[PDB]
């Protein structure tokens, strides 16, 4: 009868633009307080286990990446969401995979083809265009993290997969076809920065870069383009600790974003996200829509991740690219 729900966060801005967003309007519809804990995606998986191997859960709900939300670690320390997930098979409204087992999408980003516009107008559209030297000249860039599916999967369909037939990846037709491209590629950014300062400097001219940092090159005033053939939607989810102390009301403030599309848009408005309603995307701002992937492009030609292939063979990725890279 003093009802609330912890949730953690990043912080930050993304946390802000939560608070705006969802928390504050359904505390407001609600009576029930949000109570949000910051830190690191690694700090708050750690403090999650912790918390699960003592009784003293303190967390309701924390967001991680849906690659993470994903493995069997995540799965041993939150809750099944299958059951609770069903309730939202009364619309098609929510894009494909919007709840599942380890939690329910809030938000997606998008790993894209970005080039630089040339003069006679003749732009990369496709992974295979970015493997065109002759057509499409200049530096390419590509990052360089721990984990390369991205990469790899870029190399698969530039090498002509078609992307329903992309998972399971054929890592050694992938690592082939990388070989060709591996002499022009000036810059393995590890930073967003440094894709953002690379194309400043003009280090290369055709890259596969955040959605996030091109729209911020594109809003600095630079001749910067990107294509959503074949672009990476990854997001993040909002899962349910195990056992957590308030789980009624934790799984009411995840059913008020699954059904709000308005508190989405504004939240994805803020983000420069892909929210898993259609409503959502469609609902946003003439601006904010200008500059992110439609719903027929999320369902036609955007590549959406295998979250049980890349976790199995993880360790196997990493083990190979760092060797690659030598």
Not at 284 to 291: C, N
């Amino acid at each position: 009868m003093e009802q609330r729900v912890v949730i953690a966060t990043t912080g930050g801005t993304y946390e802000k633009a939560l608070r705006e967003a969802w928390f504050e309007p359904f505390t407001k519809a609600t009576g029930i307080k949000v109570v949000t804990v910051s830190g690191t995606d690694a700090e708050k998986r750690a403090k999650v286990t912790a918390m699960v191997q003592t009784g003293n859960v303190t967390w309701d709900l924390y967001l991680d990446g849906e690659i993470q939300a994903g493995s069997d670690a995540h799965f041993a320390i939150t809750e099944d969401l299958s059951d609770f997930c069903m309730q939202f098979i009364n619309s098609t409204d929510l894009l494909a995979d919007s709840c599942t087992r380890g939690g329910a999408k809030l938000q997606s980003t998008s790993t894209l083809l970005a080039y630089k516009l040339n003069e006679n107008g003749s732009n990369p559209q496709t992974w295979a265009d970015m493997w065109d030297l002759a057509k499409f000249p200049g530096a390419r860039s590509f990052p360089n993290f721990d984990d390369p599916w991205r990469v790899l999967a870029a190399a698969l369909l530039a090498d002509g997969v078609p992307r329903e037939k992309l998972f399971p990846l054929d890592v050694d037709r992938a690592f082939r076809k990388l070989d060709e491209l591996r002499d022009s590629v000036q810059v393995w950014w590890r930073t967003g920065d440094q894709s953002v300062q690379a194309f400043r400097n003009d280090e290369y001219r055709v890259g596969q870069i955040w959605l996030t940092r091109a729209k911020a090159l594109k809003a600095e005033g630079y001749k910067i383009g990107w294509s959503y053939d074949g672009a990476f939607l990854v997001g993040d989810r909002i899962a349910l600790v195990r056992g957590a102390p308030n789980r009624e009301n934790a799984l009411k403030l995840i059913e008020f974003w699954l059904r709000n599309p308005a508190a989405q848009a504004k939240a994805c408005e803020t983000l420069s996200c892909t929210p898993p309603s259609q409503k959502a995307i469609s609902q946003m701002s003439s601006e904010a829509r200008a500059t992110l992937p439609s719903a027929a492009d999320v369902e036609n030609r955007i590549i959406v991740p295998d979250a049980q292939w890349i976790n199995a063979n993880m360790g196997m990725l990493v083990q190979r690219w760092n060797s690659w890279i030598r």
